[PDB]
């Protein structure tokens, strides 16, 4: 599809049972997901945004659909105010911004 | 132009004559500039990210050329990490998200 930009981009995703809002965020080099309890390993991470940083845990090779296209890559959860869709994903479901 | 994730969106802006690099952001509502000097009067704002609340200088009103795209609009100064185009000034320079 194409996504005007006059409102957030926030599209469904899935992952680890879940259906979900997320942003598609090309400001975004990593995938950060709110809250979750998520199966298996994991490795402590922080990373920074406007404000500061925040204490995210990286799972690795999680898949998940977005707006209806596959992926699977590298996921961090923590304590954001909204999923964000990072470029690791973006990359794996073709997206482009176009102008 | 069409421009891929993979690394990222960084383009030249130009702003108060001065020529910088900036991150196309689609996950990102307003724009926000690094620390610089803009002329005219502006005021006080904060806002929000994924590490909490920042105080900013909004201008509004400013010219930008971004990527060759002419735009005038409200510009937020202050300690964003890095140049940020958000939604505000995407719009404007027919900027979409396409997969
Ligand atoms: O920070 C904003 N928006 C962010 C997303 C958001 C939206 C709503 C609520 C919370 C967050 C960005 O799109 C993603 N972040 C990095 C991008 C900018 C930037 C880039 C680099 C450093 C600092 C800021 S970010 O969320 O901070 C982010 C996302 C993924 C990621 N992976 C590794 S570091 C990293 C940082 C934002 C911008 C303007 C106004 C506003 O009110 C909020």
Do not use: S
């Not at 959860?77 to 909204?82: A, D, K, L, Q």
Request: glycine share 14%; aromatic share 6%; hydrophobic share 40%.
């Amino acid at each position: 599809p194409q996504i005007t930009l006059w409102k957030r981009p926030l599209v469904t995703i899935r992952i680890g049972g879940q259906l979900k809002e997320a942003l598609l965020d090309t400001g975004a080099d990593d995938t950060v997901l709110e809250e979750m309890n998520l199966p298996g390993k994991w490795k402590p991470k922080m990373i920074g945004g406007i404000g500061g940083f925040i204490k995210v845990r990286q799972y690795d090779q999680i898949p998940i659909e977005i707006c209806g296209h596959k992926a699977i890559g590298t996921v961090l959860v923590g304590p954001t105010p909204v999923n964000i869709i990072g470029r690791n994903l973006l990359t794996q479901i073709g997206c482009t911004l176009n102008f």
